[PDB]
Amino acid sequence: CPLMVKVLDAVRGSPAINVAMHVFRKAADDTWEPFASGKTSESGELHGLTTEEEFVEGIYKVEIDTKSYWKALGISPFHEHAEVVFTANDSGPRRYTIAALLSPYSYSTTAVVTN
Amino acid sequence: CPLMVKVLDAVRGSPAINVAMHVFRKAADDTWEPFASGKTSESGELHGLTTEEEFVEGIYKVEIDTKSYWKALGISPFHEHAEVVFTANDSGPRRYTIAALLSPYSYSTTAVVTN
Ligand SMILES: CCc1oc2cc(O)ccc2c1C(=O)c1cc(Br)c(O)c(Br)c1
Ligand SMILES: CCc1oc2cc(O)ccc2c1C(=O)c1cc(Br)c(O)c(Br)c1
Secondary structure, three states: OOEEEEEEEOOOOEEOOOOEEEEEEEOOOOOEEEEEEEEOOOOOEEOOOOOOOOOOOEEEEEEEOHHHHHHHOOOOOOEEEEEEEEEEOEOEOOEEEEEEEEEOOEEEEEEEEEO | OOEEEEEEEOOOOEEOOOOEEEEEEEOOOOOEEEEEEEEOOOOOEEOOOOOOOOOOOEEEEEEEOHHHHHHHOOOOOOEEEEEEEEEEOOOOOOEEEEEEEEEOOEEEEEEEEEO
């Protein structure tokens, strides 16, 4: 599993469940092409987005639909989405965990990169 | 000053100085058109991006060039940039401060919306 996303809710102290996200990859003409998508499970995790063979070097964008998450909880949040843009696999294959901790007016994001 | 951006450095415990950023407004065709830009001051702040008359309701993106900041310090970063995408909404008088706290592999962003 070369790309995993984990989302937590800082208001409830819980995984953020059923959060949709779309992953894009920058094409040679500098446009964002669709790459993968999914939603978080009961654990707040989204696994299985890609494979080692498909997840080539490139610039990737993870767009996490945080606004829909908060709206369903009755909250009108600040951000439209949380965006995570990064170069992947520039020194060979790595495994990436993208993590996001969500509040209505704030989010924090980090990455855990392992070889 | 309806929109200000403040950037801090979590490795050095200091304002993040000379950080470049661009602000975009989402257009009718779903493209991002340039709106304003600048670099943070010695206090880590960027003032004077827009005026109350120009800062109408809509979806705005602040793209902060965090990669160049870390590169200038000789530190290898994860993100290409930090992206803050939000809707501006007229609910009485509002001033927006977008704040970002930067680490090489993580950032946190919040909004302080005041009257
Ligand atoms: C979305 C996950 C996450 O994002 C953060 C942002 C922060 O600033 C501080 C903490 C977190 C955080 C975690 O608590 C967390 C991460 C992993 Br990885 C994990 O396995 C488990 Br359990 C918990
Ligand atoms: C309480 C201030 C604060 O706490 C954080 C926690 C985070 O994880 C990330 C960022 C912040 C953060 C700021 O960016 C901030 C700092 C100053 Br100083 C300031 O004047 C303004 Br406005 C905003």
